[PDB]
Design a protein around this ligand. Structure first.
Ligand SMILES: CCOC(=O)c1ccc(OCCCCC2CCN(c3ccc(C)nn3)CC2)cc1
Ligand SMILES: CCOC(=O)c1ccc(OCCCCC2CCN(c3ccc(C)nn3)CC2)cc1
Ligand SMILES: *C(=O)CCCCCCCCCCCCC
Ligand SMILES: *C(=O)CCCCCCCCCCCCC
Lengths: 279, 117, 266, 62, 4, 135, 279, 62, 266, 4
């Protein structure tokens, strides 16, 4: 059982006990039930809060990134033969808002990858099935300059080899934070300006930002040598927090996000017009 | 390790300043943090332990101000003193190793080796 | 057993460690280790502050040079430490402060050098002055801070009456105070004789007519270092070797907190 | 290593307690599914952070 | 088994 | 327009604290930017609605009821200890939920005084003093 | 439990015991802890060395070879209708460097094969799905001269038949060394020049090399008869050492590799410029 | 032939010891996965190869 | 008790004894003493030869001189001992031979001299070559015998393609093998720092991927001696002191007897 | 089973 408390039968009152009166100045919410202010019957309650538990609230795979990668003739100008994405829940808004009801969190993370592709041009022959390499590059590790250079050797970095058309790829990541919990909010700086500094840029930092690389990047490429005809592909990344714990509740975001911090820019008017005495 | 002659004497201050302040430029400032005054003599070598003093539970192996470890500096506490017919100059060799509380995590590729096309 | 010795010491206090391979044992002044004020000797009733590791650690003062003409150096405690980190802050924020000290004097040379330093820890080291005017040395002059003062081979009376220097004139064979230096050995001491030892280590208890006093108004201990035997080397007539003084507060406690004392040292 | 638990049965077939079985295949707990058997708690740390917590029938301010 |  | 760009010296007013505004005035001067916060009151200075700030630990000083508020704060962080110079743990926000009014005198003024005490304070990693640049 | 030792609470010292002083001449590293030189508090330690164990360090599939094979009209000039690769970890640098922290090793080996293909030319019709044959030819066994000659009959040699598009192929190999451990380094020769030899080539040998064929080859071919249009394929081989043991530690490679031995050629300057008194 | 071991649980779900099950399908041990349950050892053969190993508070050279 | 010490050793093997009054203790490589092949690790089935005292005794190699420009010296084992008495005869008369070693490196000077020798015992010490040609060093060049080889401060590529030298080009800071010298300390080692000790003593076990191997085809251990800190004395710019290497085989056993191997060292 |  996990059902909510039953309603007690409550009758008329004429007393010095006054549950209906209080003083919110104290910081407290008045703990009242229907039977404190109206006559109630006995109700055997069967409803439960099973679906609003922290795990149940976040137990859903959310889209956090759309990485685009091309497979085509390596010409000689800025191309997309490989791509890189900094791992984050902040390029999207929906999961970001959910996680931000709380100041701190701690959880394991499940990543699922949906890969779609298509022919870019009207026609030059076709393409044999593609295998994709999704490589995780943790901070410090050599990042690729070329779609087939030595870093893709991946001897120590974890890589996924996904075959197009196969069931979407899936892996799990442990809790990997440098702290005891993930900070969804950090009121501070990574550096402090000191009176003895040479230029006053030595100590300059972004407000709220912590480490420069956060958690590293996912480097994505098509392992296939190019067909004559170009194939364009998109890798959609779905993120789900599992085995979740959260601390210190916060008001939800009420105005549109403006970058990785708490900054607002416009549409600062969230509430509609409604007359004071209008239902 | 002091690799000077046996007739050579001296006292040296070796130090460790946890991050957050001005990196020491004077012995005066260095004295204020973790330190060992090394006296040269029959025991040829001195060991300064840099104690784990961090805010985060794990620091990064790359450079990052948020996970910075602080500053190591060395000063003469007195000076090297030699007799006549003795070399007035000599080498000091230095060594580093981890204490039994040290650990590492999140395996990754090194930048210390690579390969041409 | 194993291989231990009278000459090799490691002193650790707070985040600081001193090693020495040529000590001449170590002195505990009057056989008393530093200790905190006991309830049955307590006088101020307010809960004390005990900063522990943040103040009771080794502070190294500015190095002085010992040469053939050096007549001697002196320091006063707590004064030499008034600007030393959090110890200094605690001293100036409280009306009352008591503290004991470990004093480590450092002076190495070579087996071919020669000379002997007399290192003396004196309770209430009142020094003599400049003038015809008695008890007239000014506070700012009485208190050199970390710099310390010096000794002289003879008494030069500060003559300028009209705009007086108000300084001490500490004569060496009179221990700067009207007595003969050879008897200074009744005070807690060690000798740094260069053929024997690199250093001296004296542990000082708080000594006073009271359990606690004003550290800003009153010095408890004086440190006097005089060359009992002059520095000499090979035939080089102008030798010079460094003397370095490192001092640590011990069992430090403070009473009577309020706004910070800012003395005028001009 | 099989783990067996009762299902909270919503719509009951016209056919009592029903169970489901779970087995972990991987050494790393991060790989595990979510148990979804989550215990709840009192809201008081949020709804009532008062040093002297008072009873609702008494005057809040006295 | 570990039947809860 | 620049995100996460408030300077350390501006982020940290010391004892003075900062203020709130009824509306968002974007610091326009691009060329030599002010790098200050622009905390709008109904958005709790941070993109949320003020009416929900009550999920945070709080009290109300309603002048017909009480002279004062007393809140005891624990250390809260993703770590057991951190850099106090680089990072603030708690913010104290005081906003007039209902405006000050008196008799009919249209320009009333009464003092608000904030007294704060550190509790169970402990420090690690001693060395030479940090001197931040607040210019 | 596998956590590291706790930090002991340690107070002030005035003694004849001097942990801080030592003599590295002895060959020994001074066994010191923070409490030997500074005052320490009691810390209950929970960190562990789980991820830096020998198995965990090598527990990753590393790219050791890219074999290219063509499927096209058998014309009459040097083609790629089949290919051969000498099995080694030395054509790549990343895993080679990791294995070489140690002098000797002993382990089982897991091979995973990623196969990708593409159309070589603008267009002549298309190609039906290809099956690949990866055959192991141990030293002594007949090597193929032709893509469909009798050796591919594989009656005793192990072969893998991989279908394009299927999950990447995977097999395991036992510890197969002629010695009790694999030698990552061999300071010797396979032959000795004798005073009584006829030419002085009889006894000549490569320094550091042991057997001529080491462990044999993987012969790769497309089993499919050629389509009209050419299909080019690449087989990427990922190697993982499992059930690992290692002996005698070594300094890591500091300068670029120059062939299968310890020879260096250039970029002999691994270290950056940094001033002696610069942080 | 099922083998059952405890997981070292890192991030704990809001729901104690959790287990995982292993079965070997093949006769050749080379085919087996890695147990990753690895015991450690003393560094002394490397950090202290001395014939007379001495204690850190005593003089290294005597 | 009585008067014993870490610095004073006597090593006795066969009819040979070494004394030293200034040692820095002694190293047993990887914590393993030399031992004979056990029946459950045995591979050749023929009854072994164990020459004992006739081979397991101290052979002293030709002395090398250490001067201000000396970049370093190296030796290989068993090669440095191939011509050493009955050990050499046993090595060349058998296809198989295993043996451990006690290595004693000798270098005294005076309390006014200065310098430090890094002495390293490396398992499988493969060295780098002369050329564009990889793994091309000739057997006769790879094996200097008792003479040993040297290190260089830099890589001079043997250019003469047409009639190649087929020699090693061991660069000192790269430990002659593509790695950084400062990490060579993970190998069994001692330092002869002249203010501390006259000598180094390293005991080597047989190390190999096999219980026994061909001693003529394969060296087991490399001995590398590099000056970590350069030799210096008084002000005399061209000082020179001898380094002497004495080595003893231990637990030597040989299998596969037949007619003598005569390698061509031309 | 062989539960360790
Ligand atoms: C920047 C703000 O957001 C966060 O604070 C925040 C906090 C926690 C988050 O969890 C992600 C941390 C793990 C980072 C990566 C670790 C490994 N990942 C892998 C690894 C290998 C493969 C093949 N695929 N994915 C993918 C995720 C992500 C973001
Ligand atoms: C040359 C230097 O490297 C080595 O010393 C070294 C040591 C050990 C190594 O392990 C490989 C030895 C096994 C060789 C092969 C044995 C069988 N293999 C097979 C066999 C059949 C199939 C279908 N696919 N692969 C593939 C590997 C590889 C290299
Ligand atoms: C506990 O699990 C003992 C009972 C096992 C029953 C058979 C399990 C079959 C599935 C094996 C899982 C292997 C996962 C690597
Ligand atoms: C020990 O394993 C006895 C219990 C077996 C439980 C059922 C196993 C089902 C999987 C069979 C594996 C067959 C592998 C060739």
């Amino acid at each position: 059982q996990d059902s909510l408390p039953d309603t007690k039968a409550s009758g008329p009152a004429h007393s010095k006990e006054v549950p209906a009166l209080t003083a919110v100045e104290t910081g407290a919410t008045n703990p009242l039930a229907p039977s404190d202010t109206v006559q109630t019957r006995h109700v055997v309650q069967r409803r439960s809060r099973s679906e609003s538990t922290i795990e149940s609230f976040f137990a859903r795979g959310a889209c956090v990134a759309i990485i685009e990668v091309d497979n085509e003739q390596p010409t000689t100008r800025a191309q997309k033969l490989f791509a890189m994405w900094r791992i984050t829940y902040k390029d999207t808004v929906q999961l970001r808002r959910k996680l931000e009801f709380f100041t701190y969190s701690r959880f394991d993370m499940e990543f699922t990858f949906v890969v779609t592709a298509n022919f870019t041009n009207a026609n030059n022959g076709h393409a044999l099935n593609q295998v994709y390499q999704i490589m995780y590059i943790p901070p410090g590790a050599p990042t690729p300059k070329s779609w087939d250079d030595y870093t893709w050797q991946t001897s120590s970095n974890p890589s996924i080899f996904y075959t197009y058309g196969a069931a979407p790829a899936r892996i799990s990541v442990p809790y990997v934070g440098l702290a005891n919990a993930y900070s969804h909010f950090y009121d501070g700086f990574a550096k402090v300006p000191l009176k003895t500094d040479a230029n006053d840029q030595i100590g300059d930092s972004l407000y709220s930002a912590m480490t420069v690389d956060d958690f590293g990047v996912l480097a994505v490429r098509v392992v296939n040598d190019h067909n004559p005809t170009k194939v364009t592909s998109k890798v959609r990344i779905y993120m789900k927090p599992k085995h979740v714990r959260v601390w210190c509740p916060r008001p939800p975001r009420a105005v549109p996000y403006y970058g990785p911090g708490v900054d607002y820019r416009n549409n600062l008017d969230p509430l509609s017009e409604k007359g004071l005495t209008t239902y | 390790l002091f690799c000077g002659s046996m007739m050579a004497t001296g006292k040296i201050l070796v130090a460790y300043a946890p991050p957050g302040a001005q990196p020491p430029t004077s012995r005066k400032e260095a004295m204020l943090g973790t330190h060992v005054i090394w006296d040269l003599g029959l025991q040829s070598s001195c060991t300064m332990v840099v104690p784990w003093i961090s805010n985060v539970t794990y620091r990064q192996t790359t450079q990052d101000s948020f996970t910075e470890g602080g500053y190591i500096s060395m000063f003469y506490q007195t000076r090297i003193v030699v007799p006549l017919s003795t070399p007035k100059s000599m080498s000091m060799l230095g060594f580093v190793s981890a204490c039994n509380d040290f650990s590492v995590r999140l395996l990754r590729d090194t930048t210390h080796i690579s390969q041409s096309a | 057993a194993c291989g231990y010795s009278d000459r090799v010491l490691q002193l650790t206090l707070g985040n600081s460690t001193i090693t020495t391979q040529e000590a001449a044992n170590s002195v505990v002044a009057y056989g008393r280790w530093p200790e905190f004020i006991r309830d049955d000797e307590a006088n101020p009733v307010d809960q004390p502050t005990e900063p522990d590791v943040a103040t009771c650690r080794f502070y190294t003062l500015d190095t002085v040079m010992w040469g053939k003409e050096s007549k001697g150096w002196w320091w006063k405690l707590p004064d030499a430490l008034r600007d030393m980190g959090l110890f200094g802050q605690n001293m100036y924020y409280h009306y009352l402060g008591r503290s004991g000290y470990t004093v480590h004097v450092q002076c190495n040379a070579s087996k071919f050098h020669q000379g002997a330093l007399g290192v003396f820890a004196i309770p209430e080291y009142c020094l003599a002055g400049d003038s015809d005017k008695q008890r007239y040395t000014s506070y700012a002059n009485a208190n050199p801070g970390e710099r310390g003062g010096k000794f002289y081979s003879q008494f030069n009376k500060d003559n300028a009456v009209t705009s007086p220097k108000r300084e001490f004139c500490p004569v060496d064979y009179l221990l700067g105070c009207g007595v003969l230096l050879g008897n200074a050995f009744v005070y807690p001491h060690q000798i740094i004789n260069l053929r024997t030892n690199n250093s001296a280590t004296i542990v000082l208890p708080y000594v006073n007519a009271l359990a606690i006093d004003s550290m800003v108004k009153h010095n408890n201990w004086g440190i006097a270092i005089l060359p009992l035997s002059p520095l000499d080397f090979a035939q080089d007539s102008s030798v010079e070797i460094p003397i370095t003084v490192t001092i640590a507060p011990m069992c430090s406690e403070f009473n009577g907190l309020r706004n910070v004392t800012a003395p005028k040292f001009q | 290593g099989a783990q067996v638990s009762s299902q909270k049965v919503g719509a009951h077939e016209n056919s009592s307690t029903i169970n489901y079985t779970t087995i972990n295949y991987y050494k790393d707990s991060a790989s595990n599914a979510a148990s979804k058997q989550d215990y709840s708690q009192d809201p008081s740390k949020f709804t009532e952070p008062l040093k002297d917590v008072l009873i609702k029938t008494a005057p809040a301010l006295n | 088994i570990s039947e809860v």
